[PDB]
Design an enzyme around this catalytic site. Sequence first.
Site, PDB file in Angstrom:
ATOM      1  N   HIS A  61      -8.537 -21.256  33.119  1.00 44.81           N
ATOM      2  CA  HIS A  61      -7.744 -22.384  32.491  1.00 44.81           C
ATOM      3  C   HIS A  61      -8.327 -23.448  32.070  1.00 44.81           C
ATOM      4  O   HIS A  61      -7.924 -24.251  31.131  1.00 44.81           O
ATOM      5  CB  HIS A  61      -6.509 -22.261  33.253  1.00 44.81           C
ATOM      6  N   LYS A  72       2.364  -8.928  23.188  1.00 40.91           N
ATOM      7  CA  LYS A  72       1.282  -8.256  23.076  1.00 40.91           C
ATOM      8  C   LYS A  72       0.758  -7.699  24.559  1.00 40.91           C
ATOM      9  O   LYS A  72       0.221  -6.562  24.454  1.00 40.91           O
ATOM     10  CB  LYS A  72       0.075  -9.005  22.237  1.00 40.91           C
ATOM     11  N   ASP A  73       0.967  -8.228  25.488  1.00 42.75           N
ATOM     12  CA  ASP A  73       0.676  -7.732  26.738  1.00 42.75           C
ATOM     13  C   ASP A  73       1.605  -6.592  27.221  1.00 42.75           C
ATOM     14  O   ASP A  73       1.032  -5.745  28.068  1.00 42.75           O
ATOM     15  CB  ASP A  73       0.562  -9.036  27.823  1.00 42.75           C
ATOM     16  N   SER A 106      -9.450 -19.617  26.612  1.00 33.92           N
ATOM     17  CA  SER A 106      -9.876 -18.333  26.157  1.00 33.92           C
ATOM     18  C   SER A 106     -10.917 -18.586  25.261  1.00 33.92           C
ATOM     19  O   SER A 106     -10.962 -19.570  24.197  1.00 33.92           O
ATOM     20  CB  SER A 106      -8.732 -17.450  25.686  1.00 33.92           C
ATOM     21  N   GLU A 130     -17.708  10.580  41.663  1.00 32.95           N
ATOM     22  CA  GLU A 130     -16.570  10.067  40.956  1.00 32.95           C
ATOM     23  C   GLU A 130     -17.250   9.280  39.506  1.00 32.95           C
ATOM     24  O   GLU A 130     -18.316   8.684  39.601  1.00 32.95           O
ATOM     25  CB  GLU A 130     -16.069   8.663  41.492  1.00 32.95           C
TER      26      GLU A 130
HETATM   27  C1  HEC Z   1     -18.464  -9.500  35.259  1.00 32.36           C
HETATM   28  C2  HEC Z   1     -17.373  -9.936  34.390  1.00 32.36           C
HETATM   29  C3  HEC Z   1     -15.712  -9.828  34.634  1.00 32.36           C
HETATM   30  C4  HEC Z   1     -15.143  -8.983  35.521  1.00 32.36           C
HETATM   31  C5  HEC Z   1     -15.650  -7.780  36.291  1.00 32.36           C
HETATM   32  C6  HEC Z   1     -13.784  -9.237  35.257  1.00 32.36           C
HETATM   33  N1  HEC Z   1     -13.453 -10.235  34.523  1.00 32.36           N
HETATM   34 FE1  HEC Z   1     -11.679 -11.268  34.030  1.00 32.36          FE
HETATM   35  N2  HEC Z   1     -12.742 -12.445  32.770  1.00 32.36           N
HETATM   36  C7  HEC Z   1     -14.288 -12.543  32.496  1.00 32.36           C
HETATM   37  C8  HEC Z   1     -14.526 -13.223  31.488  1.00 32.36           C
HETATM   38  C9  HEC Z   1     -15.829 -14.071  30.973  1.00 32.36           C
HETATM   39  C10 HEC Z   1     -13.431 -13.819  30.995  1.00 32.36           C
HETATM   40  C11 HEC Z   1     -13.002 -14.672  29.727  1.00 32.36           C
HETATM   41  C12 HEC Z   1     -12.902 -13.961  28.430  1.00 32.36           C
HETATM   42  C13 HEC Z   1     -12.861 -14.924  27.427  1.00 32.36           C
HETATM   43  O1  HEC Z   1     -12.036 -15.566  27.159  1.00 32.36           O
HETATM   44  O2  HEC Z   1     -13.175 -14.372  26.190  1.00 32.36           O
HETATM   45  C14 HEC Z   1     -12.277 -13.270  31.791  1.00 32.36           C
HETATM   46  C15 HEC Z   1     -11.096 -13.218  31.272  1.00 32.36           C
HETATM   47  C16 HEC Z   1      -9.977 -12.518  32.099  1.00 32.36           C
HETATM   48  C17 HEC Z   1      -8.422 -12.671  31.944  1.00 32.36           C
HETATM   49  C18 HEC Z   1      -7.671 -13.526  30.769  1.00 32.36           C
HETATM   50  C19 HEC Z   1      -8.404 -13.167  29.283  1.00 32.36           C
HETATM   51  C20 HEC Z   1      -8.782 -12.167  29.028  1.00 32.36           C
HETATM   52  O3  HEC Z   1      -9.858 -11.680  28.735  1.00 32.36           O
HETATM   53  O4  HEC Z   1      -7.775 -10.971  29.125  1.00 32.36           O
HETATM   54  C21 HEC Z   1      -7.767 -11.985  33.008  1.00 32.36           C
HETATM   55  C22 HEC Z   1      -6.514 -11.973  33.139  1.00 32.36           C
HETATM   56  C23 HEC Z   1      -9.055 -11.522  33.878  1.00 32.36           C
HETATM   57  N3  HEC Z   1     -10.127 -12.013  33.250  1.00 32.36           N
HETATM   58  C24 HEC Z   1      -8.868 -11.021  35.018  1.00 32.36           C
HETATM   59  C25 HEC Z   1      -9.475 -10.208  35.475  1.00 32.36           C
HETATM   60  C26 HEC Z   1      -9.379  -9.066  36.636  1.00 32.36           C
HETATM   61  C27 HEC Z   1      -7.850  -8.941  37.232  1.00 32.36           C
HETATM   62  C28 HEC Z   1     -10.504  -8.428  36.986  1.00 32.36           C
HETATM   63  C29 HEC Z   1     -10.602  -7.208  37.888  1.00 32.36           C
HETATM   64  C30 HEC Z   1     -10.598  -7.555  39.125  1.00 32.36           C
HETATM   65  C31 HEC Z   1     -11.700  -9.291  36.117  1.00 32.36           C
HETATM   66  N4  HEC Z   1     -11.022  -9.953  35.137  1.00 32.36           N
HETATM   67  C32 HEC Z   1     -12.720  -8.465  36.159  1.00 32.36           C
HETATM   68  C33 HEC Z   1     -15.330 -11.957  33.304  1.00 32.36           C
HETATM   69  C34 HEC Z   1     -14.883 -10.604  33.907  1.00 32.36           C
HETATM   70  C1  LIG Z   2     -18.899  -1.610  54.927  1.00 28.09           C
HETATM   71  C2  LIG Z   2     -19.800  -1.490  53.873  1.00 28.09           C
HETATM   72  C3  LIG Z   2     -19.813  -1.481  52.916  1.00 28.09           C
HETATM   73  C4  LIG Z   2     -18.328  -1.239  52.118  1.00 28.09           C
HETATM   74  C5  LIG Z   2     -20.665  -1.047  51.866  1.00 28.09           C
HETATM   75  C6  LIG Z   2     -20.563  -0.864  50.366  1.00 28.09           C
HETATM   76  C7  LIG Z   2     -21.432  -0.828  49.496  1.00 28.09           C
HETATM   77  C8  LIG Z   2     -20.669  -0.481  48.350  1.00 28.09           C
HETATM   78  C9  LIG Z   2     -21.942  -0.272  47.089  1.00 28.09           C
HETATM   79  O1  LIG Z   2     -21.722  -1.793  46.418  1.00 28.09           O
HETATM   80  C10 LIG Z   2     -20.395  -2.359  46.241  1.00 28.09           C
HETATM   81  C11 LIG Z   2     -21.540   0.893  46.404  1.00 28.09           C
HETATM   82  C12 LIG Z   2     -20.094   1.288  46.306  1.00 28.09           C
HETATM   83  C13 LIG Z   2     -21.881   0.955  44.749  1.00 28.09           C
HETATM   84  O2  LIG Z   2     -23.309   0.576  44.741  1.00 28.09           O
HETATM   85  C14 LIG Z   2     -23.622  -0.689  44.012  1.00 28.09           C
HETATM   86  C15 LIG Z   2     -21.888   2.173  43.858  1.00 28.09           C
HETATM   87  C16 LIG Z   2     -21.633   2.163  42.537  1.00 28.09           C
HETATM   88  C17 LIG Z   2     -22.864   3.283  44.278  1.00 28.09           C
HETATM   89  C18 LIG Z   2     -22.730   4.650  43.575  1.00 28.09           C
HETATM   90  C19 LIG Z   2     -22.934   5.834  44.270  1.00 28.09           C
HETATM   91  O3  LIG Z   2     -22.139   6.805  44.730  1.00 28.09           O
HETATM   92  C20 LIG Z   2     -22.255   8.049  45.364  1.00 28.09           C
HETATM   93  C21 LIG Z   2     -21.102   8.573  45.808  1.00 28.09           C
HETATM   94  O4  LIG Z   2     -19.859   8.311  45.232  1.00 28.09           O
HETATM   95  C22 LIG Z   2     -21.121   9.998  46.297  1.00 28.09           C
HETATM   96  O5  LIG Z   2     -19.919  10.621  46.886  1.00 28.09           O
HETATM   97  C23 LIG Z   2     -19.411  11.473  45.964  1.00 28.09           C
HETATM   98  C24 LIG Z   2     -22.368  10.293  46.815  1.00 28.09           C
HETATM   99  C25 LIG Z   2     -23.512   9.685  46.507  1.00 28.09           C
HETATM  100  O6  LIG Z   2     -24.902  10.170  46.809  1.00 28.09           O
HETATM  101  C26 LIG Z   2     -25.192  11.502  46.595  1.00 28.09           C
HETATM  102  C27 LIG Z   2     -23.396   8.455  45.793  1.00 28.09           C
HETATM  103  C28 LIG Z   2     -24.627   7.512  45.475  1.00 28.09           C
HETATM  104  O7  LIG Z   2     -25.675   7.997  45.638  1.00 28.09           O
HETATM  105  C29 LIG Z   2     -24.164   6.407  44.695  1.00 28.09           C
HETATM  106  C30 LIG Z   2     -25.607   5.340  44.289  1.00 28.09           C
HETATM  107  C1  LIG Z   3      -5.633 -17.506  29.310  1.00 22.41           C
HETATM  108  O1  LIG Z   3      -5.886 -16.114  29.204  1.00 22.41           O
HETATM  109  C2  LIG Z   3      -5.053 -15.344  29.784  1.00 22.41           C
HETATM  110  C3  LIG Z   3      -4.541 -14.153  29.475  1.00 22.41           C
HETATM  111  O2  LIG Z   3      -4.711 -13.905  27.939  1.00 22.41           O
HETATM  112  C4  LIG Z   3      -5.383 -12.755  27.343  1.00 22.41           C
HETATM  113  C5  LIG Z   3      -3.411 -13.083  29.873  1.00 22.41           C
HETATM  114  O3  LIG Z   3      -2.937 -12.117  29.378  1.00 22.41           O
HETATM  115  C6  LIG Z   3      -3.220 -13.379  31.427  1.00 22.41           C
HETATM  116  C7  LIG Z   3      -2.209 -12.355  32.137  1.00 22.41           C
HETATM  117  C8  LIG Z   3      -2.575 -11.735  33.570  1.00 22.41           C
HETATM  118  C9  LIG Z   3      -1.944 -11.323  34.252  1.00 22.41           C
HETATM  119  C10 LIG Z   3      -0.569 -10.630  34.204  1.00 22.41           C
HETATM  120  C11 LIG Z   3      -2.770 -10.766  35.752  1.00 22.41           C
HETATM  121  C12 LIG Z   3      -2.333 -11.761  36.844  1.00 22.41           C
HETATM  122  C13 LIG Z   3      -3.293 -11.384  38.195  1.00 22.41           C
HETATM  123  C14 LIG Z   3      -2.855 -11.556  39.540  1.00 22.41           C
HETATM  124  C15 LIG Z   3      -4.002 -11.125  40.595  1.00 22.41           C
HETATM  125  C16 LIG Z   3      -1.580 -11.776  39.679  1.00 22.41           C
HETATM  126  C17 LIG Z   3      -3.863 -14.775  31.978  1.00 22.41           C
HETATM  127  C18 LIG Z   3      -3.555 -14.885  33.486  1.00 22.41           C
HETATM  128  C19 LIG Z   3      -4.790 -15.277  31.152  1.00 22.41           C
HETATM  129  O4  LIG Z   3      -5.471 -16.444  31.893  1.00 22.41           O
END
Ligand code: HEC
Ligand SMILES: C/C=C(C)/C=C/C=C/[C@H](OC)[C@@H](C)[C@@H](OC)[C@@H](C)CCc1oc2c(O)c(OC)cc(OC)c2c(=O)c1C
Ligand SMILES: COC1=C(OC)C(=O)C(C/C=C(\C)CCC=C(C)C)=C(C)C1=O
Lengths: 178, 378, 48, 105, 53, 53, 60, 75
Positions: B200, B226-227, B204, B270
């Site tokens: 914010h 749109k959402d 965006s 998965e």
């Molecule tokens: C690794 C990158 C990444 C991940 C994963 C990600 N975000 Fe974002 N998100 C961004 C970025 C960068 C923007 C800004 C996008 C823009 O303005 O073009 C954004 C924008 C958004 C927006 C508002 C604008 C839009 O793009 O719709 C929301 C809401 C959002 N994020 C929520 C989430 C939620 C909920 C998750 C899942 C827990 C999440 N994001 C996962 C990087 C990410």
């Molecule tokens: C308390 C400790 C905790 C919570 C530790 C958490 C670690 C989490 C990781 O990072 C977040 C992890 C989920 C992430 O790695 C980056 C995934 C993309 C890994 C993908 C993944 O899946 C498998 C799987 O699903 C299987 O079953 C059907 C069996 C598997 O072997 C045969 C795998 C496997 O070989 C790998 C690499």
């Molecule tokens: C400036 O861009 C933004 C949008 O435009 C693309 C959105 O559409 C939304 C709507 C997001 C929602 C309903 C998820 C809220 C998440 C939680 C954990 C309550 C937000 C917040 C936003 O900042």
Amino acid sequence: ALQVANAIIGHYDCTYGGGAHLSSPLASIAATNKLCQSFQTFNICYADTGLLGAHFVCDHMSIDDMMFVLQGQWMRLCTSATESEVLRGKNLLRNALVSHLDGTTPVCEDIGRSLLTYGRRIPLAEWESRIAEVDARVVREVCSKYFYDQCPAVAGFGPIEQLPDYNRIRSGMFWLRF
Amino acid sequence: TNIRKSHPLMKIVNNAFIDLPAPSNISSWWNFGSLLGICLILQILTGLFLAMHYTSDTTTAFSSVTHICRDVNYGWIIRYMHANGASMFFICLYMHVGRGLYYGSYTFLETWNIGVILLLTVMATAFMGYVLPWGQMSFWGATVITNLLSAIPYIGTNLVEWIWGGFSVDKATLTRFFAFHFILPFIIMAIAMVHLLFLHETGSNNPTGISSDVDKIPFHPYYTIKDILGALLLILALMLLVLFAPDLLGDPDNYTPANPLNTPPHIKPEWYFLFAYAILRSIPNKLGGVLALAFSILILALIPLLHTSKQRSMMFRPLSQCLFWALVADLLTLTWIGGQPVEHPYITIGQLASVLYFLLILVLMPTAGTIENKLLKW
Amino acid sequence: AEPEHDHRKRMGLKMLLMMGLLLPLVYAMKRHKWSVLKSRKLAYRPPK
Amino acid sequence: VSASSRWLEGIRKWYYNAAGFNKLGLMRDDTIHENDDVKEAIRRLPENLYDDRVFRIKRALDLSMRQQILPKEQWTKYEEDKSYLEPYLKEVIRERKEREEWAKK
Amino acid sequence: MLTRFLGPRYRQLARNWVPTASLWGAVGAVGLVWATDWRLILDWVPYINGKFK
Amino acid sequence: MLTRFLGPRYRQLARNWVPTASLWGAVGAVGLVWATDWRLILDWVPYINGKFK
Amino acid sequence: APTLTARLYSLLFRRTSTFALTIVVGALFFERAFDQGADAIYEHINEGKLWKHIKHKYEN
Amino acid sequence: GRQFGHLTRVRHVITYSLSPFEQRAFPHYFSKGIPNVLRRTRACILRVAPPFVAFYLVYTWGTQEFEKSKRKNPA
Ligand code: HEC
Ligand SMILES: C/C=C(C)/C=C/C=C/[C@H](OC)[C@@H](C)[C@@H](OC)[C@@H](C)CCc1oc2c(O)c(OC)cc(OC)c2c(=O)c1C
Ligand SMILES: COC1=C(OC)C(=O)C(C/C=C(\C)CCC=C(C)C)=C(C)C1=O
Ligand code: HEC
């Protein structure tokens, strides 16, 4: 009745004495919170149509607040206008009408204009009869007819970034509570 | 003076969801942010109603899940809404990351970096969730992924046994995985708010990558509507899956109870883990394989340092457009390989695809940006 | 394996028919609001 | 006077057309990423160039929303593309690098 | 003590809002009846009949 | 590309902060050793001995 | 003024409370008419098959 | 923390808008809509499609090669 309702909302500018205490809720709120420089309500008449609403002049950070309060007044008068403020508008219109027809020139204009538009001169005692008939029920009926859930024409000039989007101006033309 | 504008709580709602200046401009690729929020609360709500009937003991865990699906009034929709919502959560995540990569949205450093944490947290959450019904995929999933820590030298073994509760996956493992899987979505929800707070600050980005202050529109009614449409498409996509094909995206092997003596022949992740799985097993080394896995997702945090281009978005960058799509198709290649056994053609092409993943992001896309700069005399 | 089988397909037909109403209706709702922007006309009028 | 410099120019014109910001009526310098150097160069622009830039960007963001494009006649010709931001940007880069040379001492 | 809000204007203001407050009750009654499938009231409604005979 | 931060002043600024960064490492090493009861290092320490003989 | 969307708006849509009342009354009669239809379509596409059509084989 | 009235500076730009109730939601929906999607497709096909056919060829070959390899003949 529209003129009564417009009188209730009234006019304002920054040189008006005593702002806070003005009767019009719009004029009062605008004075206290420095929402504008001026506003005026109007009812421009043409043959079989016209323009009914308001105009204002304000700072760039104030257009939203001005528009909100203006629209709320229109909505308030449609839904919940009361006897006392309608009397005030009635009185303001008797005072405006009589104070206007004062001098040879405004009277001559009125003779000339009225014969083009009404085909008669409508005498002062007729207007008073027409004013007297207006009460709160009439203001609620007649404002609702023209204002409530109608599409406005909007004109903006100057620093107007904060001028509300048209959809949000359209949404200001009804009330979800009503 | 507005009640919407000055009330200390509604203030927050108004400055986020109503009066928030947003570009005139943002396409369907911007719908995934709200969709991730919908996914988050869908998973919270179903997950809560599953928690009302689930028991986290090894003797009874499989029995409770099937008790949900047979005996609990409408327990079946809740269970498979949850299952397919987790996959919906991943489709939306991948779209959302890819949008960010394409449009140069990563230049919002804090928003992006928090996003990377959000990806890792939702990955760890969904791993835990899959452990819970105590099928065969649950057990070996729990075995392999916990064992990734055993690659940390000197202390890795102690760490794996520390999170297990003993020398093997057991009674202790499942009860804590229920607890970890319960809380982590709320921690996610809190990080999603900080994600939005950093966003914010700038507002965006948009398709052009050009600043849009010259043409902002209010979030309401335009992006509220749109959402809503976008969410109604998300409901279609989800309810197609639960009602016409509930098990399409899962594994049949998770319908046999966990068995510590036999790992199945066919075992794959998965679908949404398959690319990262394919990367790790392309390396015939323990430490290198897990280091590549960590690097396959942590790389996103290097992408801002490797942006060479004088333009933000890929919209006016055809060389970069081509190489972006090579990245998507290569990722699609890696999820295909992840699905296949470690045998002749698949070992090599998966190794080459792994190399290409890292070469595209590290070398080939930064060089494309420089060439594109030079071609515009920049 | 799946006693819900007949119930999920009943709800599915309801889901498809409902979505066949709601998807074009919400689309029209969204288009109706986006009308003001999608048909807007710009003019640039600099001095001198 | 070169066949090869005409060739590089023709690859450049090709790239220009492929980039397709000219399809929205943009100039090259309208599409530049706004960092601190660039925001200042924009600040330094005279009234006329400032007001032209905002309208071009307005017109582009309008088209990008409609997912439409200008009639071909109204595309910005590569030869007619004014590098209007570049001299200010060079000066802003030049001033920063002087500061950074002083910060070294 | 609430005597601020007692006088001819507030009497008119209440009278204006009465058809609206009546209709919002009529909205909410049917909405409660619909949401719960309130058997007591819906037995009267001449076509809404999920119970046979 | 990081060449902004290379010159005589930054060489002096690094030199100034070196005893401090060394001492913050010395803080953190002992703190890790203390928190984990790191057996490898604490066997050397002539009075801290929880293991007999 | 003869037209039907006009009289729909004049009588029912103009006021938000009447608008809400017409939606909730509308939702009651929709739930009946849709569940009536969608069940009858599902039952006809599965002509015998379900325990509702089997019922009469095993007695009173 | 950004608000209308504080965003940026714009001069000399007129915007004409119409009410939603004055205008159609689907103005010329198929007549203009179809020509546009084709134009958008043409614009991007050479950028989007060739990696995915390149996936498709490696898919088709890889599945075929794996199938053939787990057959014998002269042994
Ligand atoms: C690794 C990158 C990444 C991940 C994963 C990600 N975000 Fe974002 N998100 C961004 C970025 C960068 C923007 C800004 C996008 C823009 O303005 O073009 C954004 C924008 C958004 C927006 C508002 C604008 C839009 O793009 O719709 C929301 C809401 C959002 N994020 C929520 C989430 C939620 C909920 C998750 C899942 C827990 C999440 N994001 C996962 C990087 C990410
Ligand atoms: C308390 C400790 C905790 C919570 C530790 C958490 C670690 C989490 C990781 O990072 C977040 C992890 C989920 C992430 O790695 C980056 C995934 C993309 C890994 C993908 C993944 O899946 C498998 C799987 O699903 C299987 O079953 C059907 C069996 C598997 O072997 C045969 C795998 C496997 O070989 C790998 C690499
Ligand atoms: C400036 O861009 C933004 C949008 O435009 C693309 C959105 O559409 C939304 C709507 C997001 C929602 C309903 C998820 C809220 C998440 C939680 C954990 C309550 C937000 C917040 C936003 O900042
Ligand atoms: C209030 C607790 C709760 C929350 C919140 C929660 N879930 Fe779950 N989840 C459960 C329980 C209990 C199960 C076991 C029942 C089952 O297997 O469906 C489960 C099952 C799962 C499964 C396995 C599905 C299957 O049956 O194959 C996945 C995957 C999953 N959760 C992911 C998620 C994701 C992603 C989130 C959101 C970040 C989440 N869950 C939110 C409690 C929760």
